[PDB]
Ligand binder design. Structure first.
Ligand SMILES: O=C(O)C(=O)Nc1ccc(C[C@@H](c2nc3ccccc3o2)S(=O)(=O)Nc2ccc(F)cc2)cc1
Length: 298
């Protein structure tokens, strides 16, 4: 039990310090490409960059940069692409990357407007009849349906490569109630949503890595990937005792900087893992209780 560890860290009020040690221990690799001057206007934040070694390269000879990273969790045998919320000029790049990388699911953890600021471009069509064409990457996107729920929406989209005319279905999971630099309202609303993503098949190895983003692709994206991988590792071994959360977070930060932005987000990660563990160890009925506690209807 990371449970014991959780009570001791709480009991002695020391998340700030435990989170600070992750920060000082975390990895540091270069981001030369992200920092090229031709890429300035492809980055949302000056100080949030993909390492060169783990960046996703677009397949066009023009300029292959995008602010995204392949988090390849070897032992857990899942991968995720974490990326900033796209920008008015980089939405073509975004869906280029989804196409080239054979992603089936995009997980969006932020709202387009937060705290009065435009934190993400409006990169998917809000109405079936108003589809989008990205001239630059020669792709078309169209909203097929949506299922709107109290704190999250699930869209089904169709992505077409206009060159070849092949079409794919992309599922879009939008958590709408998670403040920037914040935590979800409970472990339950969080897990209910993670489980809906899992249940979609989007995270299968038959598919490319799921794309996860928030505004910068590190705080909230961090939090969600970390819990998913920890659950998964615990699931693989059917052994809570042997998942070390901080060390998994450190493994993740080898592929992208800054994953998990606050001590509270770290603490929440733990709660979410501890809570999810129940389902993974065979109490199936905990899933239904999360649907209830989360209040996904009205
Ligand atoms: O959508 C999200 O959930 C999200 O993750 N958002 C988000 C993340 C990071 C930042 C920027 C900050 C930052 N950028 C870093 C890059 C790597 C790791 C952490 C980072 O935090 S900062 O650099 O501007 N602040 C700072 C830098 C240095 C200091 F000494 C104090 C303070 C802004 C929004």
């Amino acid at each position: 039990e990371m449970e014991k560890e959780f009570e001791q860290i709480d009991k002695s009020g020391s998340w700030a310090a435990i989170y600070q040690d992750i920060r000082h221990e975390a990895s540091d690799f270069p981001c030369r490409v992200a920092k090229l001057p031709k890429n300035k206007n492809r980055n949302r934040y000056r100080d949030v960059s993909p390492f060169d070694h783990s960046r996703i390269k677009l397949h066009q000879e023009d300029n292959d940069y995008i602010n995204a990273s392949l988090i390849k969790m070897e032992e857990a045998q899942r991968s995720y692409i974490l990326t900033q919320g796209p920008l008015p000029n980089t939405c073509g790049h975004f869906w280029e990357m989804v196409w080239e990388q054979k992603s089936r699911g995009v997980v969006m953890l932020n709202r387009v407007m937060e705290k009065g600021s435009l934190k993400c471009a409006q990169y998917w069509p809000q109405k079936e009849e108003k589809e989008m064409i990205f001239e630059d990457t020669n792709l078309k996107l169209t909203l097929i349906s949506e299922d709107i729920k109290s704190y999250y929406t699930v869209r089904q989209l169709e992505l077409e490569n206009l060159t070849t005319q092949e079409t794919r279905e992309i599922l879009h999971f939008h958590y709408t109630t998670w403040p920037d630099f914040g935590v979800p309202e409970s472990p339950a609303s969080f897990l209910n949503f993670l489980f809906k993503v899992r249940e979609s098949g989007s995270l299968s190895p038959e598919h490319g890595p799921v794309v996860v983003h928030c505004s910068a692709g590190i705080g909230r994206s961090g939090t969600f990937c970390l819990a998913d991988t920890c659950l998964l590792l615990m699931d693989k071994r059917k052994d809570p005792s042997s998942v070390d959360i901080k060390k998994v977070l450190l493994e993740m930060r080898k592929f992208r900087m800054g994953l998990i932005q606050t001590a509270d987000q770290l603490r929440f990660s733990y709660l979410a893992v501890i809570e999810g563990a129940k389902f993974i160890m065979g109490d199936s009925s905990v899933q239904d209780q999360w649907k209830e506690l989360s209040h996904e209807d009205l």
